[PDB]
Amino acid sequence: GTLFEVVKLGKSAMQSVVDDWIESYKQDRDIALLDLINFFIQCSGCRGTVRIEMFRNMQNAEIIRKMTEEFDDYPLTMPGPQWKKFRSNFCEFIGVLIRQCQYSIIYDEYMMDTVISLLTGLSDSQVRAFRHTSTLAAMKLMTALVNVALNLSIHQDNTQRQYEAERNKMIGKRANERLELLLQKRKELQENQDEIENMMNSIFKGIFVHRYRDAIAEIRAICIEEIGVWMKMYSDAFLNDSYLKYVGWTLHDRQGEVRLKCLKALQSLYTNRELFPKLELFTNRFKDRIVSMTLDKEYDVAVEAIRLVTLILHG
Numbered sequence: 001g002t003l004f005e006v007v008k009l010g011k012s013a014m015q016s017v018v019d020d021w022i023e024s025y026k027q028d029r030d031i032a033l034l035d036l037i038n039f040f041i042q043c044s045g046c047r048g049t050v051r052i053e054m055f056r057n058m059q060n061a062e063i064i065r066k067m068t069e070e071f072d073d074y075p076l077t078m079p080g081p082q083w084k085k086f087r088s089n090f091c092e093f094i095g096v097l098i099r100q101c102q103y104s105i106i107y108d109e110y111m112m113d114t115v116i117s118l119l120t121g122l123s124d125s126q127v128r129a130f131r132h133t134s135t136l137a138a139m140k141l142m143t144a145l146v147n148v149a150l151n152l153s154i155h156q157d158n159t160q161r162q163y164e165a166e167r168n169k170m171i172g173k174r175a176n177e178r179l180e181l182l183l184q185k186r187k188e189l190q191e192n193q194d195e196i197e198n199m200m201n202s203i204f205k206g207i208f209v210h211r212y213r214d215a216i217a218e219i220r221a222i223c224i225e226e227i228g229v230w231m232k233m234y235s236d237a238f239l240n241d242s243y244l245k246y247v248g249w250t251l252h253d254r255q256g257e258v259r260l261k262c263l264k265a266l267q268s269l270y271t272n273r274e275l276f277p278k279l280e281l282f283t284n285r286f287k288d289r290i291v292s293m294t295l296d297k298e299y300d301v302a303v304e305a306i307r308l309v310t311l312i313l314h315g
């Protein structure tokens with residue numbers, strides 16, 4: 001509208017184009033998902049693009065095989081001023097996309113299933129460009145969903161408090177309308193969080209447990225950093241010995257970049273004198289490796305290992 005109106009309402013090009021994509025998704029899910037598929041293809045530097053006939057007929061396996069052939073050094077590796085902000089932008093786009101879709105579209109069984117299936121497929125590609133782009137996308141996706149789960153939890157607590165105040169207020173009285181709405185609201189929100197847990201499982205089992213072991217050091221670094229982020233954000237789901245294995249194991253990685261990430265992840269956990277209890281078996285298992293890395297070889301890795309060890313000591 002007016003210049004004052006557009007300034008007082010700071011929609012970035014990303015927020016604006018995610019809002020347009022959502023309007024497009026509501027008119028025609030198929031062309032919207034086709035554009036979202038093409039986005040992830042273009043973001044790998046792949047020169048091909050999927051048309052509706054391929055989308056509606058061909059499996060993701062065939063689409064990826066056909067797009068693999070159309071490959072001429074991809075956006076995420078590019079040096080130059082015109083690609084500086086790409087990684088940061090690509091990451092924020094996925095956050096904005098899912099933040100916006102979090103109350104309706106995410107729970108439709110079509111959109112998240114399409115993306116995750118494409119990303120899982122591209123994460124199994126021989127092409128480094130596809131594996132790098134899809135994995136970083138999946139890692140930021142999981143974190144977007146973890147924030148969705150965090151938001152649900154708040155609404156679940158308020159729906160719970162409201163049901164408690166009504167369940168009490170009745171007692172000896174036939175369960176009125178308000179108590180049946182609240183009892184249904186509460187089922188819905190838990191059923192919503194099951195679907196989020198479901199999507200997180202597909203991403204973890206499909207992408208993470210394969211990509212954290214990837215040939216490319218930067219792909220291993222991307223995975224480790226983000227399981228670190230999930231473990232801090234969403235302690236009860238992600239902070240356990242099964243998931244911690246991956247981070248702790250990777251302390252033996254051959255590259256400074258990756259060993260540096262493992263320590264930064266553990267650092268953020270051990271600062272919180274609260275989930276320190278849940279790190280007791282892990283500290284016992286990997287004290288030797290953590291402690292050894294204080295004289296790592298890579299100065300900066302050693303500095304972090306020392307900072308980690310001084311955090312473990314103080315607790």
Ligand SMILES: CN(C(=O)[C@H]1CCNC1)c1ccccc1
Nearest residue numbers: 240241242244245248281282285
């Ligand atoms: C590496 N590790 C394991 O034993 C794996 C395999 C079975 N449980 C998880 C471990 C031990 C203590 C604390 C965290 C992880």
